[PDB]
Amino acid sequence: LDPVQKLFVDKIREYRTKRQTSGGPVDAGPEYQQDLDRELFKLKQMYGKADMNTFPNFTFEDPKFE
Amino acid sequence: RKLALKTIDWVAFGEIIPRNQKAVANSLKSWNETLTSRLATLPEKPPAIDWAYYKANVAK
Amino acid sequence: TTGRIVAVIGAVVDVQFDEGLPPILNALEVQGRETRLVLEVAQHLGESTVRTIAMDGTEGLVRGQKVLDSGAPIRIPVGPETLGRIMNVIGEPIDERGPIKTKQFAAIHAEAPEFVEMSVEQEILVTGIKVVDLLAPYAKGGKIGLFGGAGVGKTVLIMELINNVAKAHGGYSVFAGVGERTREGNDLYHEMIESGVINLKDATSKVALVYGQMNEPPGARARVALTGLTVAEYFRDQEGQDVLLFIDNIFRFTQAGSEVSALLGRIPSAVGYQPTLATDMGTMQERITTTKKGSITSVQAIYVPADDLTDPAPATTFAHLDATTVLSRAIAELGIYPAVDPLDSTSRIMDPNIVGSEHYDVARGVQKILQDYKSLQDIIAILGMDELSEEDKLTVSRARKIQRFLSQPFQVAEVFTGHLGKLVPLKETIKGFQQILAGEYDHLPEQAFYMVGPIEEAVAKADKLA
Amino acid sequence: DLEETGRVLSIGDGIARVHGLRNVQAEEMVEFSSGLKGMSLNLEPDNVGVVVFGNDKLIKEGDIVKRTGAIVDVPVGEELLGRVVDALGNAIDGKGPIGSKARRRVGLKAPGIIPRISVREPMQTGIKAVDSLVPIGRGQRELIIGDRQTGKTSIAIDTIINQKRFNDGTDEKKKLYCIYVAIGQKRSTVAQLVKRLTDADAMKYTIVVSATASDAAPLQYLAPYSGCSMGEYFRDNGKHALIIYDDLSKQAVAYRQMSLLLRRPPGREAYPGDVFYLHSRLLERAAKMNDAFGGGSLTALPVIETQAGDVSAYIPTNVISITDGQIFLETELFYKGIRPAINVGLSVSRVGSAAQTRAMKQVAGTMKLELAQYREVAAFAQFGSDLDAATQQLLSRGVRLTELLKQGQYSPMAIEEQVAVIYAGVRGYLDKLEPSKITKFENAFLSHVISQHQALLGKIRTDGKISEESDAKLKEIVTNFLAGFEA
């Protein structure tokens, strides 16, 4: 993604060492998981709430006439 | 449906006296103008979605 | 690392640590100062001397005495165990229920959350006050700043606000007594005891008290603001909460800063101020707000020095204010409560649309009416009445009712009022004045709108008379 | 390397006496141990008084002071248009790296005489009161004066938003790059504000330089200068840039403060004196340039938000002496509900006519007068009650116009429309109407002219001027349509 090869050897392989594992991507990291669960629900609260894996179909209405 | 083409001579409109409606006409005009202003605005079409974009991009 | 007291000029403690110089902001604990004497480094002066601030007493400080760096800037316990606790600035009780112990400590100086998680917009909170809600529709999580003179029933008001609000509240509340009177805090204490929402079956009360009283040295007073912030940011963001943050009184903070400025060797800006006064504002104020991570409804008692607002300090403040709450001493003097200067109190969300523009508009007629009426006052002041114009004569009277109508006695402070105070929901309000706009009362006793809540009751108040 | 590196000679309070770097270029942006920049503002022989750009709690003493060896530049581009950055060009929006990665010295000097050109372009704001009573040119530097959010900003907004269409028009003579230098306008303020511009996405040709209340003072100070190079750029590239410096008032505050901390003075009102100069040099860089410079412009809308209308107030006096008027916005009126709340007696454009359409000029010229006169019988005899019957009519006329020059909260326009309602009143078809309903008349009237007389307007729009067509139609329209509006 970026450069220097001895330092980046330490890091760029460590980009993908994380990705070079995917059940806990050499660490998902319990803290990451915990705060993730916090923000993911809290995000949900900060969102609109009508389930995000469901289609909001239509509604119908009838306007004032005298 | 589309629009209804009724032209309204507002001069004549309010005047009516089938007496249960003359008062109604005075109100119904203004009730109209509320409806008239409302429809005349409303944006005709809403948008729709670049399904392909979000198809990629929603990963639930 | 250790320092030598090299110069003590009061609680401006000039320390030479020769044991390297830890951050500007590194918090120091003084050795030979059993009683925890915090100094915070202010300057690296050079010479391995820092100018640090003791926030506290400067007893027995031999010049040389060892001061031991606390190795971080000032950190305090933050944790739910603070609510219902009167915490001082130093994270310690003054609840005196033993130590206010928490899980986590926090360095109290901190970042002002970034713009993007900051919710960019807000919604008017309702205070239960006609005058407020109507005229300066303050926002939930906003920073509302209570400009107000000395003890001008402000203190009364805030308490009443607590009363009106904190109860109802869903999240929790913080009171940061900045330069608060020990007494008022007492008063509050009991009120709170009393209220029992400082329930003591709760150190998780509905309200946390952090107090940094007047009797403290400025450094403490200066710092109580950061402290409180730190806790609350924790409850808001961290404990999710809608925090109500009662600060009474940031001015006293400001003052604490300014007070040091001189003998921070600084030029203490105008009147003595701080040149950095502003940055000071940013640095606290920008930290408190409403994020998406909750709301810190920020209630700042602001002493308006000499009720001088042009006074740069307040001058600045308005900028920071989501809600600027200006209490009118002038009005107050008329004995009036709500005593506001609402033609000075604002909410940016006072702007039509937002708040229901009718609501607003009803206000606009009033705002106008009163204002024009205000205009007249020089003329009237001499001239009184009888060569002016009639419509105005009407407005005058109407205004006079309106004026009265804003007035509402104190519900809590029946001790103060005698009266029972009142509380008015929206409708009577909107209508109330609007009704006056309809001038439905113009043969009804004018003053009768005084110290009322609902216009109905006011109408009634005219009536018993006639 | 560590040889044109230095050790922090002393530090605290972000005032770095800087040891070393002894070959330092004046006003070299320096490079920190903390990464950070600073400005070697002050070359003292034995130190470099370095203004620390940004936070210094980080900092400690003897710390290594590195040259950046650079006199400040800022990234420049049009890829600032549609970007909220801080002045260094740092996305705070979280819009990621700007396309503006060309850089340009933030100090680049103000034009020559010959290089400059006078204005003769109008420009507009979508605000009747404004375009009429303060017709707008291009390449400005003239004072906007008023107090805070009232939607103080509204005033600006409707203008920016107004340029949207113009940016939907063409030329740098319709299209306009808006530059909002926000000096000390809190994150919230901005947060909201930005949120608006974006919504209006008038943001698209628009930089928002965002210096929120938090920001360090030099930065905020700088923010305009930053903008300044960028706007001159636009100017010189034919682009007509609009900077709203909101506000230099705060800037001064910072600037002095900075000075003071450098012990560098507190002149009159505590501000050292070349803050005028500061700005003068800054603002001269806003001009309408000749064609060699693409003809572009940097229109400067400086803003000063007054504390209590305090204008003999140093910086205001100063500013007044540069500006070619001030647009005083009047609060009482505000409370009256009159938003915009102006006092146009205290709004002046010496400029006047270079700044406007004929269209407007024709209807407005008289109008100004009609109000003037209206005011006058409120005034010689400081009573709104009358002195002559004639005027009992004329006053009506004035009053009508009063209803008209208002501007909706959160609402701009364009000139032919503006003229449309204005003609109606000027040539009077609505003193045969009650003053409050005049605006009401407009809603309908406007929606009518928009509907029908977009044709006609097509002409007026074409002519930049009311034409015989338009007029002929108008006389008739206004009467008829008005007649329809009523009856």
Structural domains in chain D plus CATH codes: 1-70 (2.40.30.20), 71-356 (3.40.50.300), 357-487 (1.20.150.20)
**Residue A7 maps to which CATH number?**
6.10.280.200
Q: Is C151 on the interface with A (CB under 8 A)?
A: no
The first and second tokens of residue C392, run together, are 């105005």
The first and second tokens of residue C23, run together, are 């951050």
Which parts of D314-409 fold into alpha helices (H)?
314-322, 331-336, 358-379, 389-405
The first and second tokens of residue C234, run together, are 């924790």
| Domain ranges across chain C | 1-73, 74-349, 350-466
Q: Tokens 């004497």 label which residue?
A: C37
Compute the half-sphere exposure of residue D237: CA atoms within 13 Å on the CB side of its CA: 11
> Residue C294 is inside which H or E element, if any?
strand C294-303
Task: For residue D378, report the phi and psi dihedrals to the nearest 5 degrees.
Answer: -70, -40
Cβ neighbours of residue D471 under 8 Å, at least 6 residues apart? D423
The first and second tokens of residue D63, run together, are 């710390």
Compute the half-sphere exposure of residue C204: CA atoms within 13 Å on the CB side of its CA: 7
Alpha-carbon distance D467 to nearest alpha carbon in chain C (angstroms): 37
Q: How far apart are the first and last CA of chain C?
A: 79
Chain center to CA of B21: 22
Q: How far is C311 from C149, CA to CA, in rounded Å?
A: 13
The reply to whether A27 falls in a domain is: yes
Distances (CA, A) of C147 to C23, C324, C335, C417: 35, 7, 18, 22
Sign of the C-alpha dihedral computed for residues C60, C65, C66 and C69 taken in this order: positive
The reply to whether A54 falls in a domain is: no
Q: Does domain C74-349 have CATH number 3.40.50.300?
A: yes
Q: How far is D18 from C85, CA to CA, in rounded Å?
A: 46
Nearest to D49 by CA among D83, D15, D24: D15
Report whether D299 contacts D306 (CB < 8 A).
Answer: no
Beta-ladder partners of C9: C12
The secondary structure of residue D352, as a DSSP letter, is: G
The reply to whether A36 falls in a domain is: yes
Is residue C66 annotated as involved in ligand binding?
Answer: no
- Coil, helix or strand at residue C165: helix
Question: Does D60 sit within 8 Å of C279, measured CB to CB?
Answer: no
The first and second tokens of residue C380, run together, are 């009237």
Report whether C248 contacts C158 (CB < 8 A).
Answer: yes
Query: What residue numbers bound the domain in which A20 lies?
Result: 1-48
The secondary structure of residue D20, as a DSSP letter, is: -
Beta-ladder partners of C28: C39, C69
Out of D196, D350, D375, D427, the active site residue is: D350
CATH topology of domain C350-466: 1.10.1140
Strands (DSSP E) contained in D236-280 are: 240-246
Beta-ladder partners of A35: none
Using a 10 angstrom Cβ sphere, with 0-12 exposed, 13-18 middle and 19 or more buried, the burial of residue B30 is exposed
Report whether C344 contacts C324 (CB < 8 A).
Answer: yes
The reply to whether A17 falls in a domain is: yes
Nearest to D178 by CA among D234, D133, D237: D234
Q: How far is D393 from D384, CA to CA, in rounded Å?
A: 14
Strands (DSSP E) contained in D87-148 are: 90-91, 102-105, 116-117, 143-146
CATH class of C1-73: mainly beta
Distances (CA, A) of C34 to C2, C89, C213, D454: 15, 18, 22, 83
- Coil, helix or strand at residue C212: strand
Q: How far is D297 from C125, CA to CA, in rounded Å?
A: 45
Report whether D57 contacts C109 (CB < 8 A).
Answer: yes
Q: Tokens 């007493």 label which residue?
A: C57
Using a 10 angstrom Cβ sphere, with 0-12 exposed, 13-18 middle and 19 or more buried, the burial of residue C125 is buried
Q: How far is C207 from C229, CA to CA, in rounded Å?
A: 14
Is residue C152 annotated as involved in ligand binding?
Answer: yes
| Other CB atoms within 10 A of residue D310 CB | 14
- Coil, helix or strand at residue D31: strand
Which parts of C92-169 fold into alpha helices (H)?
130-135, 154-165
Examine chains D and C and say if they touch (3+ CB pairs below 8 A). yes
Find the closest chain D residue to C22 by CA distance.
D60
Q: How far is C175 from C162, CA to CA, in rounded Å?
A: 10
The reply to whether A65 falls in a domain is: no
Domain count for chain A: 1
The first and second tokens of residue B28, run together, are 């119904």
Using a 10 angstrom Cβ sphere, with 0-12 exposed, 13-18 middle and 19 or more buried, the burial of residue C253 is buried
Alpha-carbon distance B24 to nearest alpha carbon in chain A (angstroms): 8
Q: How far is C178 from C256, CA to CA, in rounded Å?
A: 10
Whether a cis peptide bond, with omega within 30° of 0, leads into C338 is: yes
Is residue D257 annotated as involved in ligand binding?
Answer: no
Residue numbers in A near C293 (CB within 8 A): 42
Beta-ladder partners of D29: D39, D70
Using a 10 angstrom Cβ sphere, with 0-12 exposed, 13-18 middle and 19 or more buried, the burial of residue C416 is middle
Report whether D296 contacts D173 (CB < 8 A).
Answer: no
> Residue D132 is inside which H or E element, if any?
helix D128-133
Q: Is C293 on the interface with A (CB under 8 A)?
A: yes
Sequential DSSP letters for D200-231: TT-GGGEEEEEE-TTS-HHHHHHHHHHHHHHH
Alpha-carbon distance D184 to nearest alpha carbon in chain C (angstroms): 9
Report whether C166 contacts C197 (CB < 8 A).
Answer: yes
Report whether C123 contacts D100 (CB < 8 A).
Answer: no
Nearest to D59 by CA among D216, D259, D225: D216
The secondary structure of residue C237, as a DSSP letter, is: I
| Chain A residues near any Cβ of chain B (below 8 Å) | 52-53, 66
Report whether D427 contacts D475 (CB < 8 A).
Answer: yes
Out of C33, C75, C130, C154, the active site residue is: C154
Chain center to CA of C163: 15
Question: Does A52 sit within 8 Å of B60, measured CB to CB?
Answer: yes
Strands D143-146 and D326-328: parallel
Report whether C154 contacts C304 (CB < 8 A).
Answer: no
The first and second tokens of residue C259, run together, are 């007070």
Sequential DSSP letters for C10-27: TTEEEEEE-S----TT-E
Question: Does A66 sit within 8 Å of B27, measured CB to CB?
Answer: yes
Out of C181, C266, C364, C400, the active site residue is: C181
Using a 10 angstrom Cβ sphere, with 0-12 exposed, 13-18 middle and 19 or more buried, the burial of residue D112 is exposed
In chain D, how long is the greatest CA-to-CA distance? 87
Strands C172-178 and C242-248: parallel
The reply to whether A57 falls in a domain is: no
Nearest to C81 by CA among C91, C68, C89: C91
Whether a cis peptide bond, with omega within 30° of 0, leads into D443 is: no
Nearest to C237 by CA among C289, C282, C198, C283: C289
Alpha-carbon distance A53 to nearest alpha carbon in chain B (angstroms): 7
Question: Does C240 sit within 8 Å of A46, measured CB to CB?
Answer: no
* Torsion, CA C85, CA C86, CA C91, CA C94, rounded to 10: -110
